[PDB]
Structure 1
Amino acid sequence: SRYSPEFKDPLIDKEYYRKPVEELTEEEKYVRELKKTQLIKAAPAGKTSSVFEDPVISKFTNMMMIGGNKVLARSLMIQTLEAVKRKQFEKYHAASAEEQATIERNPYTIFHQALKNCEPMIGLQVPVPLPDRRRRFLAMKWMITECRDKKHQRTLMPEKLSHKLLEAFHNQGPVIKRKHDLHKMAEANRALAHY
């Protein structure tokens, strides 16, 4: 890497820098004094301080990216969010007053809940626990691979991804089925956990 090891990763969080000095611990004070003397890497073109920035969505878009086409991946992601929001709004308007309380219209909340549902707690052969990062990566990769499946013909990526995300938000869909299959396989191979 062109950055020397002395360089440290930047910390983009306005609350961290606007935090009052009094609330800082002695350890935090020492951390700030140390950072005052540390070389810091340039902020990557991906993340900013925008209140609308979502690291989960940014990582999902990067995973969707094919051949460095960040523009197209971001377009697909925003189209998917718009499709989810429009479908939820249609359901909200078509529903009665009681059901309107239950219907969720936030695309970001829907996306996060769907990915959380798709996260497999167990993995594999000998079944083994999975760390949090591996769980999130598996959920995202399963969603993307399922949406990229040839089983859906002539349907654009935004529509397929919105449909799968809504299925996952209701604990259904082929991604949740894949998670359940992995869980069942791990349960079956539990007898080999002594290895």
Structure 2
Amino acid sequence: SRYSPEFKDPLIDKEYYRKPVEELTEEEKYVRELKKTQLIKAAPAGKTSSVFEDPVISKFTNMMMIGGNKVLARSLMIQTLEAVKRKQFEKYHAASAEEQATIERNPYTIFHQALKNCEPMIGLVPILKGGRFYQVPVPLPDRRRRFLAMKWMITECRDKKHQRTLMPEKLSHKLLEAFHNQGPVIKRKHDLHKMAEANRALAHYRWW
């Protein structure tokens, strides 16, 4: 790394700095005084103080990236969000007065809930001894399950069975399916939850 160990990561949150001195605890006050001394790294291209910033969508865009082509990945992401918005407006305009109160049109709410519906709770970790790798059920950490939801969505949208259907349209359809607890990604979550219940023999190894 070109940065020394001294350099610390920056904090881009904009409302943190405006917190009044009165609300500061002695511990938070000490941390604020300590950051005064430290060297801080330059903020990387990416996250900003903008109010439309969304870390989850940024990570999804980075996971769709191929060959460092960030312009194309962000273009695909915004096309997907626009497509979800337009499809929900289409469904809302054709819906009855009493079905309009339950149609979500915010594409960000749909994206977040769709990814949340695809997160697994349990997974399997192989462990090595005796020459035989042993598959033990494990409760997945929050980071791991958030990553797996995104990876499953992107792999599902990269399947070659979707011939000439463009990625924004495939991804919007998959997101709207997962928003309603349907589709192949929810089934992939279920098939891991069942294949972890089929192997509860080694269910109590707590030291993966």
Q: Settle same-fold status: TM greater than 0.5.
A: yes
Query: Going by fraction, where is strand more abundant, 1 or 2?
Result: 2
Deviations 1:71-99 (A, max 9, x none): 00000000000000000000000101111
Cα 1:27–1:194 shift into 2, 3 Å: closer
* Deviation of the 1:4 alpha carbon: 0.7
Deviations 1:152-182 (A, max 9, x none): 1110000000000000000101000000000
Deviations 1:80-126 (A, max 9, x none): 00000000000000101111110000101100000000000110x11
* Deviation of the 1:194 alpha carbon: 4.5
CA distance in 1, matches of 2:204, 2:172: 41
CA distance in 1, matches of 2:11, 2:97: 45
| Structure 1 stretches of at least 4 aligned residues deviating more than 6 Å after TM superposition | none
CA distance in 1, matches of 2:4, 2:105: 46
Share of identical aligned residues, percent?
100
Query: Going by fraction, where is helix more abundant, 1 or 2?
Result: 1
Q: CA RMSD in A?
A: 0.7
CA distance in 2, matches of 1:153, 1:97: 38
CA distance in 2, matches of 1:142, 1:149: 11
Which ranges in structure 2 are unaligned for 5 or more consecutive residues?
124-134
CA distance in 1, matches of 2:110, 2:173: 12
1:85 — aligned with what?
85
TM (norm. structure 2) is 0.92
Give aligned pairs, total.
194
CA distance in 1, matches of 2:198, 2:139: 15
TM (norm. structure 1) is 0.98
* Deviation of the 1:193 alpha carbon: 2.0
CA distance in 1, matches of 2:92, 2:201: 47
- What SS class does the counterpart of residue 22 from structure 1 fall into? helix
